[PDB]
Coordinates of C-alpha atoms and ligand atoms in Angstrom, one line a residue:
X83 CA 97.9 155.7 104.2
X84 CA 99.1 158.6 106.4
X85 CA 101.8 160.9 105.1
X86 CA 100.9 164.4 106.4
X87 CA 103.3 167.2 105.3
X88 CA 104.9 168.0 108.7
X89 CA 107.7 170.5 109.3
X90 CA 110.3 169.6 112.0
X91 CA 113.3 171.7 112.7
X92 CA 111.9 174.3 115.1
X93 CA 110.4 173.4 118.5
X94 CA 106.8 172.0 118.2
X95 CA 105.2 169.4 115.9
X96 CA 101.5 168.7 115.2
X97 CA 99.5 165.5 114.3
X98 CA 96.3 164.8 112.3
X99 CA 93.3 162.5 112.5
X100 CA 89.7 162.4 111.3
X101 CA 88.8 165.6 113.2
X102 CA 91.8 168.1 113.1
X103 CA 95.5 168.5 114.2
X104 CA 96.9 168.9 117.7
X105 CA 100.1 170.6 118.9
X106 CA 103.1 168.8 120.5
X107 CA 106.6 170.1 121.8
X108 CA 109.8 168.2 121.3
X109 CA 111.2 168.4 124.9
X110 CA 114.3 166.3 125.8
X111 CA 113.9 164.9 122.2
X112 CA 110.3 163.7 122.8
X113 CA 107.3 165.6 121.2
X114 CA 104.9 165.8 124.2
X115 CA 101.1 166.1 123.7
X116 CA 97.8 165.1 125.4
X117 CA 95.9 161.9 124.5
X118 CA 92.7 164.0 123.9
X119 CA 92.8 163.0 120.3
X120 CA 96.3 161.9 119.2
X121 CA 95.0 158.5 118.0
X122 CA 95.7 155.1 119.7
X123 CA 96.7 153.3 116.5
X124 CA 100.0 153.8 114.6
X125 CA 100.4 157.7 114.6
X126 CA 101.7 159.3 111.4
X127 CA 105.0 161.1 110.9
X128 CA 106.5 163.3 108.1
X129 CA 107.8 160.1 106.5
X130 CA 106.5 157.1 108.5
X131 CA 104.4 156.3 111.5
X132 CA 105.7 157.5 114.9
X133 CA 106.7 154.7 117.2
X134 CA 104.7 155.1 120.5
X135 CA 106.9 155.3 123.6
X136 CA 105.2 157.5 126.3
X137 CA 101.4 158.0 126.5
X138 CA 99.2 158.2 129.6
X139 CA 95.9 160.2 128.9
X140 CA 95.2 162.9 131.5
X141 CA 96.9 163.3 134.9
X142 CA 100.1 162.2 133.0
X143 CA 101.3 162.9 129.4
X144 CA 102.1 161.5 125.9
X145 CA 105.6 162.1 124.4
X146 CA 106.7 160.2 121.3
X147 CA 110.3 160.3 120.1
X148 CA 111.2 163.2 117.9
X149 CA 114.3 162.2 115.9
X150 CA 113.4 164.0 112.6
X151 CA 116.0 166.8 113.3
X152 CA 113.6 167.8 116.2
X153 CA 114.9 170.5 118.5
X154 CA 114.9 169.1 122.1
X155 CA 114.3 171.8 124.8
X156 CA 115.1 171.2 128.5
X157 CA 113.7 171.6 132.0
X158 CA 113.0 175.2 133.3
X159 CA 115.3 176.9 135.8
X160 CA 114.7 180.6 135.3
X161 CA 114.4 183.4 137.9
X162 CA 111.1 185.0 136.8
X163 CA 107.9 183.4 135.4
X164 CA 107.0 185.4 132.3
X165 CA 106.3 182.6 129.7
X166 CA 104.9 182.6 126.1
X167 CA 102.3 179.9 125.3
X168 CA 103.6 178.9 121.9
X169 CA 100.8 177.6 119.5
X170 CA 101.4 175.4 116.5
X171 CA 101.4 178.2 113.9
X172 CA 103.7 181.1 114.9
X173 CA 101.5 182.6 117.6
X174 CA 102.8 183.0 121.2
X175 CA 101.1 184.8 124.1
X176 CA 102.7 186.1 127.3
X177 CA 101.7 184.2 130.5
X178 CA 102.2 185.0 134.2
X179 CA 102.9 182.0 136.4
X180 CA 100.1 181.7 138.9
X181 CA 100.9 178.3 140.6
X182 CA 102.3 174.9 140.1
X183 CA 101.7 173.8 136.5
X184 CA 99.6 176.9 135.7
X185 CA 100.0 180.5 134.4
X186 CA 97.9 183.6 133.7
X187 CA 96.9 185.0 130.3
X188 CA 97.8 188.8 130.1
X189 CA 95.2 189.6 127.3
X190 CA 91.6 188.5 126.8
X191 CA 91.9 185.6 124.3
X192 CA 89.1 183.3 123.2
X193 CA 89.6 179.8 124.6
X194 CA 88.3 178.4 121.3
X195 CA 91.6 179.7 119.8
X196 CA 93.4 177.7 122.5
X197 CA 91.5 174.6 121.5
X198 CA 93.7 172.8 119.0
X199 CA 97.0 174.2 120.3
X200 CA 97.1 171.8 123.3
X201 CA 100.8 170.9 124.0
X202 CA 102.0 174.6 123.6
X203 CA 105.3 174.6 125.5
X204 CA 105.4 177.5 128.0
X205 CA 108.8 179.2 127.8
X206 CA 109.9 181.9 130.2
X207 CA 112.0 184.3 128.1
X208 CA 113.6 182.7 125.0
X209 CA 114.2 178.9 125.5
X210 CA 114.1 176.7 128.7
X211 CA 110.8 174.7 128.5
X212 CA 108.5 175.2 131.5
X213 CA 105.6 172.9 130.6
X214 CA 103.0 172.4 127.9
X215 CA 99.4 173.7 127.4
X216 CA 97.3 170.9 128.8
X217 CA 94.2 173.1 129.2
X218 CA 93.3 176.8 129.7
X219 CA 91.3 178.1 132.7
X220 CA 88.8 180.1 130.7
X221 CA 85.6 182.0 131.2
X222 CA 82.6 182.0 128.7
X223 CA 84.7 181.6 125.5
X224 CA 87.4 183.9 126.9
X225 CA 90.6 182.4 128.4
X226 CA 92.0 184.0 131.5
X227 CA 94.6 181.6 132.9
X228 CA 96.5 178.5 131.6
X229 CA 96.4 174.8 132.6
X230 CA 99.9 173.6 131.9
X231 CA 102.0 170.6 133.1
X232 CA 105.6 171.4 133.8
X233 CA 108.2 169.8 131.3
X234 CA 109.9 168.3 134.4
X235 CA 107.0 166.0 135.3
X236 CA 107.1 164.6 131.8
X237 CA 110.4 162.9 132.9
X238 CA 108.4 161.2 135.7
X239 CA 105.8 160.1 133.1
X240 CA 108.3 157.8 131.4
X241 CA 108.6 155.7 134.6
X242 CA 104.9 155.0 134.1
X243 CA 105.4 153.9 130.5
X244 CA 108.3 151.4 130.1
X245 CA 107.2 148.4 128.0
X246 CA 111.0 147.4 128.1
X247 CA 111.4 144.0 129.9
Ligands
ZN463 ZN1 111.3 178.9 133.2

């Protein structure tokens, strides 16, 4: 079976497999995450498997539908670039946008801590999704910058995954 005690109603949602749990953000009503270890079989939800809809390993994204009262964010459109990498356990860290789909950590943080929170939606001040935490440009165990995909490209990712016909 697979009935993990999830907790929707917030902003991010995690998953679980024989290894650990990843992080995923409900943007536009679709919890986005990386295929690094989300499982290719029938994923698990708080009360039923999660129907697969969007999933394209690296250089793309994986966003399933979040209908369990999931809070859907939106595309960024701020004026500054101060974000807050939100992890999946009430732990956000300020970021400084450094380039397209990337930001800078403003505090020596161990990259190992970043491992597991992949999907952390970057949010400028309080709301407006910017992108998720795909990876973290880090030095020996310490993370210095962020590897994040904007939440606008995720919209493009759907064109790749249709399966409608
Ligand atoms: Zn923004």
